Amino acid sequence: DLYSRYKKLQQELEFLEVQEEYIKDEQKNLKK
C-alpha cells in the first residue's frame, strides 16, 4: 500500500495545482 498511495498523493497534488491556478486565472479575468 506504501507505493500505491504515493502516486495518489501526486495525482491529488497535480489536480489541485491546475485548479488553484485557474481560479486565480478566472478571478483575474472576472474583474473586467
Minimum distance from residue 15 beta carbon to another protein (Å): 6
Distance in angstroms (rounded) separating the CA atoms of residues 12 and 28: 24
Beta-carbon neighbour count of residue 4 at 10 Å? 7
Number of shown-chain residues binding another protein (CB under 8 A): 27
> Mask: binding to another protein, 1-30, rule CB under 8 A, as x and -?
xxxxxxxxxxxxx-xxx-xx--xxxxxxxx
Q: Which residues contact 8 (CB under 8 A, 6 or more apart)?
A: none
Minimum distance from residue 32 beta carbon to another protein (Å): 10
Q: Name the site residues for another protein (rule: CB under 8 A).
A: 1-13, 15-17, 19-20, 23-31
